[PDB]
Scaffold this active site. Structure first.
Site, PDB file in Angstrom:
ATOM      1  N   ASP A 148       0.788  -1.231   0.000  1.00 24.97           N
ATOM      2  CA  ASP A 148       0.000   0.000   0.000  1.00 24.97           C
ATOM      3  C   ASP A 148       0.823   1.285   0.000  1.00 24.97           C
ATOM      4  OD1 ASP A 148      -2.025  -1.796   0.127  1.00 24.97           O
ATOM      5  OD2 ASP A 148      -2.853  -1.115   2.040  1.00 24.97           O
ATOM      6  N   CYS A 149       2.119   1.252  -0.314  1.00 21.31           N
ATOM      7  CA  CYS A 149       2.901   2.487  -0.290  1.00 21.31           C
ATOM      8  C   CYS A 149       2.317   3.538  -1.229  1.00 21.31           C
ATOM      9  CB  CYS A 149       4.358   2.206  -0.654  1.00 21.31           C
ATOM     10  SG  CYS A 149       5.406   3.680  -0.512  1.00 21.31           S
ATOM     11  N   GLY A 150       1.960   3.131  -2.446  1.00 24.63           N
ATOM     12  CA  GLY A 150       1.329   4.010  -3.405  1.00 24.63           C
ATOM     13  C   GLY A 150       0.099   4.693  -2.849  1.00 24.63           C
ATOM     14  N   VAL A 159       0.971   7.241   0.001  1.00 24.35           N
ATOM     15  CA  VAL A 159       1.397   8.596  -0.349  1.00 24.35           C
ATOM     16  C   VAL A 159       0.227   9.365  -0.946  1.00 24.35           C
ATOM     17  CG1 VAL A 159       3.822   7.947  -0.615  1.00 24.35           C
ATOM     18  CG2 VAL A 159       2.325   7.918  -2.619  1.00 24.35           C
TER      19      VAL A 159
END
Lengths: 122, 135
Positions: B11-13, B16
């Site tokens: 879930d980094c995308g 951010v």
């Protein structure tokens, strides 16, 4: 310099890979770097990816060919094949049918290049 | 500087994305941005961040730059950057500002969150891809 061209506006990953669509995952937004890596694993290839700079092309023990992640305008997930370098120029393969294998300036490649290089060996 | 941390490995995308859409008021769940940005097992792609941010009512511009980008004082913070962190070949940061020879970045990694970072290290991780978005 055998390069397999792209067909759909999404298969760039697979297209550099062969030189498949499901193995990496490839969905509508093209492939992710992790996808290229995974898919190359399945195919019986050792993979090491690295983040580098232009000095990578000064190395004589560089094992060609390999994949690079590049940004072309708004193709933010584009990929090339790198076959070698000659004088101050690179020989790269673009799955884009209008490009395919081309001479490319090290300056131009520097502008497009992420620094992401994916190396594979059996 | 507020930052929505990541939980899932992927879930980094989305993280951010939320972390920025939060800055201009909007609040979104990560499970939803996941769907908008078409994040799969293999994280999100730059195209996913772009499309999803548009869908969210943001005009967005992506650019390929270098460190000289931060020598321009009229730079509008915050913005998203694509970076390479270890085997995490798709990581993303938020860029909130710069102070000294250092940047203020938001890393969705719960163990990192908002951190100062040298210009050198950021240069080593950074793709050159910067995604700027505005409502």
């Amino acid at each position: 310099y055998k390069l397999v061209p792209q067909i759909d506006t999404r298969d760039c990953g697979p297209a550099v890979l062969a030189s498949l669509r499901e193995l990496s995952k490839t969905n509508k937004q093209g492939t992710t770097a992790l996808g290229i890596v995974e898919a190359a694993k399945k195919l019986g290839f050792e993979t090491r990816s690295i983040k580098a700079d232009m000095t990578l092309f000064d190395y004589n023990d560089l094992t060609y060919p390999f994949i690079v992640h590049v940004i072309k305008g708004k193709r933010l997930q584009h990929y090339y094949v790198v076959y070698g370098s000659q004088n101050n120029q690179l020989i790269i393969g673009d799955p884009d049918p209008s490009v395919k294998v081309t001479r490319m300036s090290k300056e131009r490649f520097q502008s497009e290049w992420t620094g992401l290089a994916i190396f594979l060996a059996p």
